[PDB]
Amino acid sequence: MREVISIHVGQAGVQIGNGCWELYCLEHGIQPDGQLPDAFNTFFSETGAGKHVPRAVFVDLEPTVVDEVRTGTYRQLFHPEQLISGKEDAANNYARGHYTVGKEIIDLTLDRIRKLADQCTGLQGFLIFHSFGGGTGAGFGSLLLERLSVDYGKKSKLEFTVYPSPQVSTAIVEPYNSILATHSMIDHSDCAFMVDNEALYDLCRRALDIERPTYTNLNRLIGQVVSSLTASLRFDGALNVDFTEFQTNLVPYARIHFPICSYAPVISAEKAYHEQLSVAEITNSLFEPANMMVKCDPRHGKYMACTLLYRGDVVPKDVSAAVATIKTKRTIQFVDWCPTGFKMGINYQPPTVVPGGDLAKVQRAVCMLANTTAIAEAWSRLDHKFDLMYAKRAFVHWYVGEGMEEAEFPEAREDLALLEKDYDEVAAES
Amino acid sequence: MREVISIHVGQAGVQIGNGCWELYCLEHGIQPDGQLPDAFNTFFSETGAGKHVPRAVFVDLEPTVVDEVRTGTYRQLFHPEQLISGKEDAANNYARGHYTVGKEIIDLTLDRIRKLADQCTGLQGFLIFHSFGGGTGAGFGSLLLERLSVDYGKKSKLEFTVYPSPQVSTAIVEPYNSILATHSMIDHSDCAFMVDNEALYDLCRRALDIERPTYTNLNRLIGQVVSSLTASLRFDGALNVDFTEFQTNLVPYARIHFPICSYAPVISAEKAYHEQLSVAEITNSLFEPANMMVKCDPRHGKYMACTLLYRGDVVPKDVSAAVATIKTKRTIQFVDWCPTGFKMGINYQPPTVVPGGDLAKVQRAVCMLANTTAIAEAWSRLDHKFDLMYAKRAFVHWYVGEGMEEAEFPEAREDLALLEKDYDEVAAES
Amino acid sequence: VREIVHIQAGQCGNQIGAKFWEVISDEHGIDPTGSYHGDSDLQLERINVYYNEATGGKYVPRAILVDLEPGTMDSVRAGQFGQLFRPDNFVFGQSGAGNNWAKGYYTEGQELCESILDVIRKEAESCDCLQGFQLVHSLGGGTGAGLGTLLLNKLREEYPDRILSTYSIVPSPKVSDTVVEPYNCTLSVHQLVESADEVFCIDNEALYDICFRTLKLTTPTYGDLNHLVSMVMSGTTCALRFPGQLNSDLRKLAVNLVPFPRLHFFIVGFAPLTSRGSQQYRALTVPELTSQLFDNKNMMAACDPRRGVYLTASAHFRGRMSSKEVDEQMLNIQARNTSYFVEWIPSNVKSAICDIPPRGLKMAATFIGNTTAFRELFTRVDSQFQKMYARRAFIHWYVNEGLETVEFDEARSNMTDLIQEYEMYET
Amino acid sequence: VREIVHIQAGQCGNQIGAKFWEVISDEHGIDPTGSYHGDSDLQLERINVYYNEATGGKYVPRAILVDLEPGTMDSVRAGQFGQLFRPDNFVFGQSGAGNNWAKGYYTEGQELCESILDVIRKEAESCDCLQGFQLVHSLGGGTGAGLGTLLLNKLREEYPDRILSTYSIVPSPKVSDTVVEPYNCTLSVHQLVESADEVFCIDNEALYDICFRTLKLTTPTYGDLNHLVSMVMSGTTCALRFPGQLNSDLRKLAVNLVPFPRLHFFIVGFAPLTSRGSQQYRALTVPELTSQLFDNKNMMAACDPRRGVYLTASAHFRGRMSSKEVDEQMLNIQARNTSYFVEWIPSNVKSAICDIPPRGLKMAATFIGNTTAFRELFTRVDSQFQKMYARRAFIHWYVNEGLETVEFDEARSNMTDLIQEYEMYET
Ligand SMILES: Nc1nc2c(ncn2[C@@H]2O[C@H](COP(=O)(O)OP(=O)(O)OP(=O)(O)O)[C@@H](O)[C@H]2O)c(=O)[nH]1
Ligand SMILES: Nc1nc2c(ncn2[C@@H]2O[C@H](COP(=O)(O)OP(=O)(O)OP(=O)(O)O)[C@@H](O)[C@H]2O)c(=O)[nH]1
Ligand SMILES: Nc1nc2c(ncn2[C@@H]2O[C@H](COP(=O)(O)OP(=O)(O)O)[C@@H](O)[C@H]2O)c(=O)[nH]1
Ligand SMILES: Nc1nc2c(ncn2[C@@H]2O[C@H](COP(=O)(O)OP(=O)(O)O)[C@@H](O)[C@H]2O)c(=O)[nH]1
Ligand SMILES: [Mg+2]
Ligand SMILES: [Mg+2]
């Protein structure tokens, strides 16, 4: 029919991949064994009898995360070829995952990705997951994209990655890997969505009523966003939105392609029992900085083109009333040369609950993707943290020994500066 | 009705012949005793009552391999005259197997093969098997082929021989026997197929999932290819291909005749759950260098002529679509002076499985035979290996002592250089 | 025998098309299986205008559906009237819509254009006569806006004589459904002005507003919105389909309402409209119909006529009614509001009467008018176009397809002159 | 009483003929055991054309089977209509098929030719009349291409007056089934041009294309492919077998379509063809048949007529129909598309009418045309032959059968002139 291919890289990619594919199978009708006790063609392939196989590839340079899937409940669903495991991980080193160890397995991975592309007659794009701080996520991820750019060209390569948190950090060398990866992301990727763990931690505690979450809860929220994005591509709706439509709207400039993401309603299973949650309520909740899943305040900057996606009971008449109310908010800023700024789409399939889930059975819901100049706040923090470590040359020795030429350090520094200039240059007014 | 004769020389030929008739009895449905619990007369002969007999001759200069069949379960199937065993083998010496000991038994075997041809009214080809490194495979094989050329003349002499592996080697004198036999094969053989164990081992581990194969597993893969090749003569099909049809199309020159072989799909049980195995997929697999049973990359050379053989569920519509897709892949090279390069053959009889087997019960399958200059990579390695021995005269004394004149060593070297010139001259373009 | 070929493009056109054929099939009395089970002989008089006959006692519409993705088409197949359409007329691509006017016009348009044209040629050259082509498409999208204009140029080249009447949905200014709406609309206007004889502009804002004011729909869906459009084309071609005291077809309409080749954009409205519960209290006569027709709240285009002046107007009436009563109202409404009509063209209101009303109404009326209020619509898009065009960057998505930057200047230049052309004639 | 002798050569010829006799037997109503059990007396009027009588009211076809090896007819013996054939007509060799034109013509051809000719002489001189011979063979192969041309010359030598009409499959233009096809085809071209009155060219690629486009067959087999071809020869001989308003036999066809002795290669096509799902919606009539016939996609040979120009054309019609409607259509399609017809020949299109259509179809049509588009077909094999002929070595296989160097040069030179001959007449 028309297909989308998913590639997952690293520990973050695999565990997010679990959350996504539970929700998809636990939305469509497919048992963990592949049988049934429609939109199947978009995400699954058919092998005869009654068995289905996902269109996904799982990649990591170490076996612990992958072998959890091989020994897990959902082991039977996946094709053993799809699960690729390395021997020893990159140890959070960009050069090690790019030049020495990454090139040992890069050409093995692309064959299977290309092999899956043959079955996809109506392929319209790819979805790729990363962790910026990781060695395999940033190192191997950059190498994978650079090849896929020349392999396929004019096919949308959409990405959904975890940006480093403003203060929460689990890796000391986190600034080094992110900036080197940033140069590779910007020139080859069509569009890449940012999310950070620190915002999700605060959201998963405040909106969802959880005292002490784990990575499993955060991945479940991530799964909802991706499903709503593809909901226009799977089931019927009064306003369909294709992948190619997101590419044109959300990208004003060739290098300003990073959006930021939000979802509403985010309420516990208990407290939805009191609230009606009309179209106006859920639309109003999105624009508050508290809900948004990146820890940057939009009020610091300005807004760009935005996208709204509605699921379930929504009627188009109430959307126009709600969006018009949004424009009356003087707390929300727009540039004069972007007067329209909105694309809306509606799908009738309601959101799907999760086994042992954290969300309520809401009849209607809305997903939101927006480009904003407030992301320059995130870039400045990463830029400042990088200069302190490079000024005294805190960790250069590890990266040099693994094949990286030091001249890459100033180049990635310079390219980040231009992007910071681009966000300020576009933010200017005439 | 229409007959083909099989001759097996050396230990490798005897063991392969055991596997080959093991497959044919299952394929036709003939019990090991010759009774039944069609295409029988092509491979078998009836003796009245209900007993059949293969049209095969087993020859080796030592009784160990032959007596295994004599004492084995299949002993009652074979005719006692067909099993000919010598007294002492050639000791991996070409001169011993050609001049001294080879001439002791050459005319005893030649009566036996000619006797079998009397009962073959429609005899239109022979199948002869070799191991190049063996003394009897090279020394006696040359003496047999030289006689069979003048005994029968314009009758197709097809050969299926195991070429020495690029690095896997079990005989020190291996380069010596290969070059000496090379002169004999090129002039007298109508067409000889190349295979090597090293490529067989790798495919038997990657595609077929075997940790540690034996020679028995490798022989069964060989038997599948021969069965598919002979299926056109034996069973009904929309595109019948005769031995003469293979001879005319595959070889563009007299000496360039050497083809290469491939087979698809080669899959285990659980891997076949997840793949639909369409005609396009199996044809695509035949062209990856990983599937060649000769360990030479086709990308090093070019394609001159190809023949495709399909069995079972295949429909001619999808063959034309599959082949046209192959033509678009110009990572695959054809010379301009051969634009067509293909003959396809379609048969309805599916592959036959074997108890204790290694292959999954696939509904459709395809076999591949093609000629290429990628083989010239293999000849260059053998030439460089030989010169190191002959420069210091590493093993001349053994061969001269067994009747061989030294002058044959440079002449066989010169013939190899002339053949290598032919392939490179053919590779030239206008 | 004045057959009309119907073409639908884009997500907007197909969903409009599905509801449109429900209205026409219901009026003629055709079973969703394609068989006639109606109640009057007059229905079978001139059903040939929209339908073709199949030998198995079947009636098939003269419809061609165009889209770049099958998702919209597969919804129509699952529709109630899906079986009615001829199976081979579905022409679709295998690539995303892109929402890009340049991509739809150049990359995917050329490949689809040749295949679509011959399918059109099948229905075009199959019947005894062909008066005009009817097109439904959106101007804010990429598929209908791009490929629809390309096919419009080719239709003119092969059939210059025929009336290329089109129905378009103009991007709503208050709440836009696409960020790149000004680019797509401005480029398409250049193609539409020079090629199309008749263009009717429809805004979803009024459809929302009319539903909320009059019909009192708490949750009006696109079904109701597309339904309010449905009678507009149904009423227009009704003069061809049924007898009347004064017939007025498309060519009569174009001659009267178009004073100059470039001033032909029209506003449309329908009467009567009443909430589904307040209909009891309302006596229904011809003067009551006229009051709704000229009321500024009933226009489906969000451009207030009072802010401009009228040049030409036409009214259609359906049902057995007095001819004097219709004629007197045109005189009365013209003299009462002389401040909104040009002095140098007298009798700016055209009239027509049709014998048979539509279903669900005993008397009904349709209004089509042309006025300088369109300057409001073009001012909104042009002002937004200048805002966007200085920030050249969105042309990046158009440059990669192959579009030259001077085309944007040409599109603005021609549309600017169209604004000026309406300005001068106001004097 | 216009008996026609049928000869089948090679793998392709025998399997097409086997499907051919299924169609003819069903049309006449001949039971597979060889006895009449049909439904109409009209079937018995002129069954003598293809069938020879046996004792006990049994009818045997006038068919001769030719091959180099027994495998092919053993499948024929197991066929559903295998019992129908005369046992002695099976003539075959006991050597390899070869796939070599030189081997099939010289080595095994001479032995086969003498035995086959007397078998032909059995049926040729057994009936009261003999109008022409019918041959089915492959050109990309070795047996049918080689031995068929040898037998073709001998048939002319003994029977110069009789019509030597043959059906041939052409080596495919894009993806084909043999490496040495240009050698086999080019050598046969020299024999085919001078000896055969009428040659029809057939392509498997068009057969694949027609099945996928119109019939929507997911897995079209050779049974379906041979079925579509079998309509063509069945329709051509239908004029002899049944009465009609305008009779047109083979000799009528040859005189009209062939302007010069060498320009006689023909393209064929059949109508109507419709998918099973969409056959309900069609309005099957005479004009609908005309649209399919001149449609470039339906033509069974991959040589696009629009790239060339027409010299002559002929259409056959079956069924009780209007004579005016057929005569009007042939004029309209002629004047509409004059750009593809030669000026110096008026009335480029021929027409004919037959009374009885095939089973299940109330109406059917067959189209045969001649055009310069065949220059595309010969250019493909010519360029490939030159690319082969620089590489001498393949001749070495043909040298073993006595084929000399001059034969390849002679074959290309005549075929190149055939391309030139079509080039000059385009002016
Ligand atoms: N939200 C979320 N983030 C995760 C998850 N797992 C890992 N991460 C992020 O990944 C970072 C650590 O890098 P890795 O997970 O190891 O990614 P990698 O590219 O495989 O790095 P290597 O293991 O060295 O190869 C952490 O700081 C987390 O922010 C997860 O399950 N959910
Ligand atoms: N693939 C495969 N190769 C075999 C097998 N048996 C023997 N060979 C090959 O045979 C080579 C050794 O020569 P021999 O098997 O002794 O053949 P030979 O001609 O009888 O040599 P002699 O015993 O000296 O007379 C090895 O290098 C193998 O490559 C077998 O069962 N399978
Ligand atoms: N009234 C109405 N408007 C619609 C419908 N579907 C889409 N639209 C409007 O059409 C505009 C553009 O539609 P789009 O999908 O881009 O059309 P396309 O890209 O040319 O196929 C949007 O602003 C929608 O609001 C419908 O069913 N009814
Ligand atoms: N349509 C069709 N084509 C066939 C059939 N059998 C063979 N062919 C085609 O005929 C060509 C040559 O066939 P070949 O076996 O060499 O015929 P022969 O050597 O003359 O007997 C090939 O390209 C085949 O594709 C058939 O049953 N149907
Ligand atoms: Mg890792
Ligand atoms: Mg031995």
Residue numbers in the entry:
A (entry chain FO), B (entry chain FM): 1 to 37, 47 to 439
C (entry chain DW), D (entry chain DU): 2 to 428
What does the article say, verbatim?
Doublet microtubules (DMTs) are flagellar components required for the protist Trichomonas vaginalis (Tv) to swim through the human genitourinary tract to cause trichomoniasis, the most common non-viral sexually transmitted disease. The flagellar core, or axoneme, conforms to the canonical 9 + 2 arrangement wherein a central pair of singlet microtubules (MTs) is connected via radial spokes (RSs) to nine surrounding doublet microtubules (DMTs), which transduce force generated by dynein motor complexes through the flagella. Here, we determine the 16 nm, 32 nm, 48 nm and 96 nm-repeat structures of native Tv-DMT at resolution ranging from 3.4 to 4.4 Å by cryogenic electron microscopy (cryoEM) and built an atomic model for the entire Tv-DMT. These structures show that Tv-DMT is composed of 30 different proteins, including the α- and β-tubulin, 19 microtubule inner proteins (MIPs) and 9 microtubule outer proteins. Like those in other organisms, the α/β tubulin heterodimers polymerize and assemble into rings of 13 and 10 PFs that compose the A- and B-tubules, respectively.
The resultant cryoEM maps of the 48 nm repeat DMT had a global resolution of 4.2 Å, and focused refinement improved local resolution to between 3.4 Å and 4.2 Å. Consistent with their ~ 80% sequence identities, the atomic models of Tv’s α- and β-tubulin are nearly identical to those of their human homologs, including the region of β-tubulin where many antiparasitic, benzimidazole-derived drugs (BZs) bind. Indeed, like human β-tubulin’s Phe169 and Tyr202, Tv orients Tyr168 and Phe201 into the BZ binding pocket where they are stabilized by Aro-Met-Aro interactions with adjacent Met234 and Phe21 residues and sterically occlude BZ drugs like thiabendazole (TBZ). Within the A-tubule, molecular rulers FAP53, FAP127, and Rib43a impose a 48 nm MIP periodicity and facilitate the organization of other MIPs like FAP67 and RIB72. Interestingly, FAP141 in other organisms is replaced by the smaller TvFAP12, which lashes FAP67 to the A-tubule lumen like the N-terminal helices of FAP53 and FAP127. Along with the N-terminal segments of FAP53 and FAP127, TvFAP12 spans across the B-tubule to maintain a 16 nm repeating crosslink between the A- and B-tubules. In the B-tubule lumen, we found assembly-related MIPs FAP45, CCDC173, Enkurin, FAP77, FAP52, FAP20, and PACRGA/B that are conserved amongst other organisms. Along the B-tubule side of the ribbon arc, we identified the filamentous MIPs TvFAP35 and TvFAP40, which run lengthwise along the A11 and A13 PFs respectively and may compensate for the dearth of MIPs along the ribbon arc in the A-tubule lumen. Interestingly, the Tv-DMT cryoEM map revealed the long, filamentous protein TvFAP40, running atop PF A13 at the IJ, which alters the topography of this important protofilament. In other organisms, the PACRGB N-terminus binds the groove between A11 and A13, but in our structure, TvFAP40 blocks this groove and replaces A13 as the binding partner.
